[PDB]
Symmetry: C6
Subunit: 219 residues, 6 copies
């Protein structure tokens, strides 16, 4: 990654064994549960494109997902190239060349180039641009790997309402509902999919109940 | 987080893998037992709003709780906006804009903005303001998830008084009794809810016995 | 805690995840065995009152003990206030106010205040003052939780004398005997409570035998 | 490795116990699964030839692989010597000598020599040159140790298409197919090797389906 | 401990959680096997008397040993006081007082005093003086806790000679034989205590065989 | 060890708990398998003779090996003394004395002396000289503890050739064959010791086959 040292200047530091192992182990343990994405983002703080590729390439399973991710990255790289075409022919001696989409993705750029861009004044944030492409891809993966529709999350007859709600919002998260829908669902699908006893109680509370209010009511 | 380096200036540092894993694992192990809150506060020392969101978003279960927390945060953000309305229209070039409630919560502000506020002289402590909202929300959660009323904590006939007292004050803590009530309860509900043999002994000691004195008496 | 950086100036550093987890886990594993107290003292090296409260508040069980500790702290705070009363009314602008007992204990003081006191020239050592109160309280707890009188530690007929001595001095430690008594006990209760065969051998060695000498004799 | 300290100058640092143990343990756990290579590259960030040899020599099993690697390194060293012959006879006093292939590989050079080359302006990147030879060798090993031809990866009748795709691309990776072939295979061998039900569905989608599209179709 | 910072000046640093846990766990696992002593010495590198007491006081079992150690320390402290008597009466204002034996042992000195002595030019090495007393005591403990005389280490009839030799020299180590005796024993007791078949072979090699030579001979 | 700080000057640093535990645990797990030696060398990067002795003395078993090592060290020390005799009589005040063999080995030198030599301009590399003696000794140990002659490594009738080759070269390594012999063995003993089916196939390939070629052939 690129860090500020103890003296305020931005320099390259090797990716740490702890960071490498943390990411491999979260993928092993959680696969593409939604919470793996914010973990990826945090563990890749400051990353160069080289570091992001290292993190993705150290994953041993999930190769269908990794090939889907490659495809997303290639789409975003192509759109970059559409928006930001680069001069053909020779680089000005000693000067910085402009990045292509494949330079952003770290396949045609060197670490030195990458450091040059990321530490330029002002920075050309190749690491952050690539990380956005990767996260776009990983969200597609999360949605693909979500095993259950929200329509099929219904409260069991002897299921504690809190347990039901946890299943409901875990499913909405994987299915990638917007926050508007998460906030809205409380007035609707969450009640509809409740068991008959809680549904009666929730219908009585009337509209505009907070989730806290609904959860207290059905405790 | 924002730290002071080895040379006394406040700078951003990436959240560490150890901090990320510590928080995920405490939630896995303890859920919303009351002692998880001081742990959250300590593990988020120095945090930016980005870092607080990272910590909350890396939690995989408990999504009913996380949706309740979102609701609390939105209430506090709305109250901030009531108290501290911001100018509409364009920012003075190069200058710092004033934070909105959603800027505090990290959803409409960038990391750079956040660092700018938190390192301003004097700081506009967006991380600490957000952390207070979050902790308000988490306390609501702890209270919701407390499984037992204090009324139902009574000493068993062969239960060591120390064991009973531990259950009693663990319950008062989750139920969020004030410290006045915790200090008061010793003169009352703790005795009333004691078994007959200890109750006799405690009633005899008379008023103003310390908890130490009561515990010695019923050993 | 407050540390000296690499350049010799005293600054605040966040409590580390390793320190947080070390303390929780020692309480989980050892409860209030006497050796937990020196561990607490070491793990709280440099602590502010905020940090000491964090350490105490991250403990999930033992709430009878934690309420006993609160009571001790309140007694010491009241004695501080008796010895060091503070001016009522407004603070001199920009200047440091004098700490009250509750400021020492971190309940009415901010982290900034605490850092101010602890880094004043000369320091007003609020962290060390509070840590002394806490340790006074924890020693009371250790004594309360000691399960066995020294009178009841007697050597079994087939118990190795070394094993007996270990039980004896582990018990004296929990019971909080002074060092005078620990050094004295060797001439007396340790012999009296020995089995008949070792008692014969020890009685023969005569007075002024070292513990090493007694242990060799009964090997 | 050679790192930049906190003050911007390139200096030698000892290889860490964490790095040493991470590499031994990844070889123990994964042997020569393809993802071990990017792990090696990351764990050897900044390495001198001494450090790369340390990493390879700390492996206890896999000695057939390690002898194959020695053979690769000797081939690359011989090609270096063909391209970059060095002066015979005495070194200019106090001056840097040019590296031979065996100097690159760390067998005839000292750590001091290595540091000299790697910190020269401009650097003679002996660590990076050697690491390229090693990785060439390790890729040969991965290909050798791949247990299954792609021809033999076919979807079972009750095998989820996602599971099949994961096996397919894990095999292509070990077999060291180019990225062109990985991207191409989607239009062909992946369909051909699908079970009859998915094959029907995929054949219907028509050409130019993304992997995401194929995977959705056969869910 | 007292360390040199990154800038070459000697300053106090808190004892680390890793060091605290390493020592507790080595005592738990190995008790007073001889190799615990060099471990203690290494883990206490740079220690103040406060730190050495912390390490000894964090041990929960072995209290017979810890009382024997207290006795040794008191003997060494008394001998210090005989050799280095200190002025009675008041300290010169602002100046350093001379340490007494109990000051060395950390019971009557403050951390500040200790740092003052250890960082004086030239240092009065209170930490190293105390560590020598402690190690004298711990060696006595190791010898006491050695379970077997060297006379009783004899090779079994089907015991590999290497296994026998390991038992022999592990016992000599615990019994605290000098190095002269360890080097000598090879010509004598080690042969005498060998089984008849190896004894024949060793007797034939003649005098002045190395241990390597003896071990090869009886392989 | 002696390290360069963050500012480029060579100073002493305490051996770390991680390094201490890594070495003890590798000896516990691997004993004197050949790969323990490069691990020792890496874990002792920068070591003083004090640190090397600490590492060797923290090993609890293997005392026959440790006594063999002492014997090697004494031989090398005696040869040092033959090559580099030192002046008898008093040291020039304030000046550095020349090391004897026992000074190199850390038994008659202080840490301060050792640091003085190792940080002299130019250094008198006592740590590196001692480490060479130790490694000479440890290699003797590895060879002694190798359980099987290469003559006895033959391919089983249903043993995969790769498995056989791994056993073969693991044995050559422990038996301490030169690299010439390791490279040569491929043309000979490795074929001779192959099962009849692979032997036929290897004999047909003809001379000068790479190990890769032989391994492919017998897959
Ligand atoms: C662009 C890219 C380069 C790479 O080295 N590995 C990747 C792994 C998965 C997705 C994309 C990748
Ligand atoms: C405001 C906010 C942003 C976010 O990214 N996650 C949160 C997670 C739980 C609660 C609030 C949240
Ligand atoms: C004064 C005080 C404050 C706090 O926050 N927790 C404590 C926990 C136990 C004992 C005292 C305490
Ligand atoms: C050139 C080289 C030196 C070495 O010390 N070990 C190696 C281990 C495997 C492959 C090559 C190696
Ligand atoms: C002098 C001394 C002080 C202390 O606090 N504990 C010790 C523990 C064991 C031995 C000696 C000790
Ligand atoms: C010279 C030397 C000193 C020591 O303290 N221990 C050693 C342990 C094994 C081998 C040699 C050793």
């Amino acid at each position: 990654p690129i860090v500020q040292n103890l003296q305020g200047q931005m320099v390259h530091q090797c990716i740490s064994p702890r960071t490498l192992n943390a990411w491999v182990k979260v993928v092993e343990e959680k696969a593409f549960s939604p919470e793996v994405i914010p973990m990826f983002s945090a563990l890749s703080c400051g990353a160069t494109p080289q570091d992001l590729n290292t993190m993705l390439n150290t994953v041993g399973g999930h190769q269908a997902a990794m090939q889907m991710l490659k495809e997303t990255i290639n789409e975003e790289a192509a759109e970059w190239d559409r928006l930001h075409p680069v001069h053909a022919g020779p680089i000005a001696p000693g000067q910085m060349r402009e990045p292509r989409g494949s330079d952003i993705a770290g396949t045609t750029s060197t670490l030195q180039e990458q450091i040059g861009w990321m530490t330029h004044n002002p920075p050309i944030p190749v690491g952050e641009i690539y990380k956005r492409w990767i996260i776009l891809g990983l969200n597609k993966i999360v949605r693909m790997y979500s095993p259950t529709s929200i329509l099929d999350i219904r409260q069991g007859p002897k299921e504690p309402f809190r347990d039901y709600v946890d299943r409901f919002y875990k499913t909405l998260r994987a299915e990638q509902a917007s926050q508007e829908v998460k906030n809205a669902a409380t007035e609707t699908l969450l009640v509809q999919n409740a068991n008959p006893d809680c549904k009666t109680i929730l219908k009585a509370l009337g509209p505009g109940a907070t989730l806290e209010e609904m959860m207290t009511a059905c405790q």
